[PDB]
Design a protein around this ligand. Structure first.
Ligand code: TYM
Ligand code: TYM
Ligand code: NH4
Ligand code: NH4
Lengths: 326, 326
């Protein structure tokens, strides 16, 4: 079958935006493709990380991947740092990307703005993501819209490498959801929902309790038009709530507008909050189970084993093509 | 004992400047220290390399290291790419160096000047050299003067890492020869002798034949003062020839000035050319022997084995300190 790769940074906050744009796709596609799902701890360190929190966040994210339903008999779940090939291929790709290509990355630009002394990993974040995808001969990379540009640079590098050294890499393609590719902040629906928003009301974490989810959904900024209809430009707040509702419930945006015909924001938010609770509760129960189990470590051990077998071989072919080593 | 590390890029030209500033020190110190001497093929690719020539140049350089006298029972000779830890530690160090620190590197500035689209590896050349030195708990790094600045950034990174994550690295120190730290071009003695000078008369390669060494020494730019006396500012050409003569012959600069008292440039150059021939001939004989032997591969196999054991352990401690993995 075709191969899928995708990764998530281990951090203190994993949002419903991460779930809807990514994790939901991973669970959907796992049985139909060869799947590698990575905990990108080397990318995490492109900004300072408290070492104790980083180690815990890596375990947390592995638990969340398993809690949402990633099945180790269907997919390979592993930690980026435990497969040396990622670092090795990243170096090779860094030698073929131009500085100007990295500087124009929007992710870099945003993460480094108003900064005084920027750390180099932030700039070289792309070749490492490109190595993550290309090591596995990846065909599809399911992500939310914010990663599209990185995937576009990955395709540019794979093409450049193939052209200079011979056809080695598969040119990967992004798979971005139709609805929910970009879940927006509940506090300012013109902004993406971000793990690092300083306002905790902007996002819902996958570990938010029921009272908390109710409070954040109820406080979500809307409009004065009291109509439940999708219109991103005119009604960003309601439109974003409709995307969250649709993707989590399985109901179309049309279905939801009909259902809420003549209805006001109060009932709509109460219902949505319950749909979020319904979704997160089981995830959280499974999450705690994994966090307390020795099996979490076993799953990651096996996934690293498989990923190392494949990636190490691609690295050998890349070295051979560039004429490194012997 | 103390530990020494040093590296050389595999390239089409290895000069008497490389020999005098570096290789000569490696042979001198090998019995007194734990020594790692590396063929930096990952650094080589920071600029485009023809893959076939790169593979040959790596073997050539390994032969030259053995030909000049590096003894595998005293030192560990290995290829950078064959030890994944270098790439892994380079990533970690790249996440803690600032972009501005890299941009001010003179090596980067020179290699990238008048350039149109610069390759990222050229900019991130330092963290990889820093990882090369720090992986082995290096105390001393014998090099010529042009690497001093990179070693200074390495010390800055080791200190920064120790300060943020705990004392792990030894702060390394450069060992730069008193005479011969910077062998100058024979064509323009105000310029460093460089492997990539477009004028082949500017350098002597370790594989230059006798007629060739005579021609290059005889053509070496001097002055109209016909006096053999060291004075870098006033007599750069003669001063540089005196450094080459001194370091290769074992005779002091004073000894040589006395010896050539009242003598002219002709006799002096004829003698120097013979001193260069005397030095390179045995190196070349041994060089061909290694190039035709299966033992060259065995030596590199064993050196990679040892280097991997040490470097992989340092990488595990670095990951532990940053909280990567598990
Ligand atoms: N508000 C949102 N709406 C919709 N989707 C969203 C939202 N916020 C986040 N996402 C998606 O979640 C995944 C993980 O986000 P990260 O920031 O860890 O995503 C990142 O930081 C990547 N660089 C990690 C990575 C490293 N290597 C890779 C290789 C393939 C794919 C991804 C990666 C991503 O799919 C992201 O698009
Ligand atoms: N004209 C000259 N006069 C005196 N010494 C000279 C002259 N030209 C070159 N050298 C010395 O030769 C060694 C290798 O030169 P490279 O350009 O490969 O040198 C380089 O390009 C390094 N970045 C390779 C490296 C990679 N990792 C390392 C770790 C430790 C030490 C060195 C390295 C160096 O010692 C260099 O100073
Ligand atoms: N699968
Ligand atoms: N030694």
């Amino acid at each position: 079958m075709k191969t899928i790769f995708s990764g998530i940074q281990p951090s203190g906050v994993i949002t419903i935006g991460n779930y809807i744009g990514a994790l939901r796709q991973f669970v959907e596609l796992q049985h139909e493709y060869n799947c590698y799902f990575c905990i990108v701890d080397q990318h995490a360190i492109t900004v300072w990380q408290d070492p104790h929190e980083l180690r815990q966040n890596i375990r947390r994210l592995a638990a969340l991947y398993l809690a949402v339903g990633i099945d180790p008999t269907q997919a390979t779940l592993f930690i980026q740092s435990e497969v040396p090939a990622h670092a090795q291929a990243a170096w090779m790709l860094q030698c073929i990307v131009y500085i100007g290509e990295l500087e124009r990355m929007t992710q870099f630009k945003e993460k480094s703005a108003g900064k005084e002394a920027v750390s180099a990993g932030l700039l070289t974040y792309p070749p490492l993501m490109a190595a993550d995808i290309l090591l596995y001969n990846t065909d599809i990379v399911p992500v939310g819209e914010d990663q599209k540009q990185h995937i576009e640079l990955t395709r540019d590098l794979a093409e450049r490498f193939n052209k200079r050294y011979g056809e080695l890499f598969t040119i990967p393609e992004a798979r971005i959801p139709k609805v929910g590719a970009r879940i927006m902040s509940l506090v300012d629906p013109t902004k993406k929902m971000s793990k690092s928003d300083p306002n905790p009301k902007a996002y819902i974490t996958l570990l938010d309790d029921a009272k908390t989810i109710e409070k954040k959904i109820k406080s979500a900024v809307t409009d004065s038009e009291g109509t439940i209809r999708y219109d991103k430009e005119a009604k960003p707040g309601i439109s974003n709530l409709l995307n969250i509702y649709s993707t989590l419930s399985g109901q179309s945006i049309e279905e939801l507008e009909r259902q809420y015909e003549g209805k006001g924001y109060g009932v709509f938010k109460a219902d949505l909050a319950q749909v979020v609770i319904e979704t997160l509760r089981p995830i959280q129960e499974r999450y705690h189970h994994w966090m307390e189990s020795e099996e979490l470590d076993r799953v990651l051990d096996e996934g690293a084993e498989k990923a190392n077998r494949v990636a190490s071989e691609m690295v050998r072919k890349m070295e051979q093509a560039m004429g490194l080593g012997r």
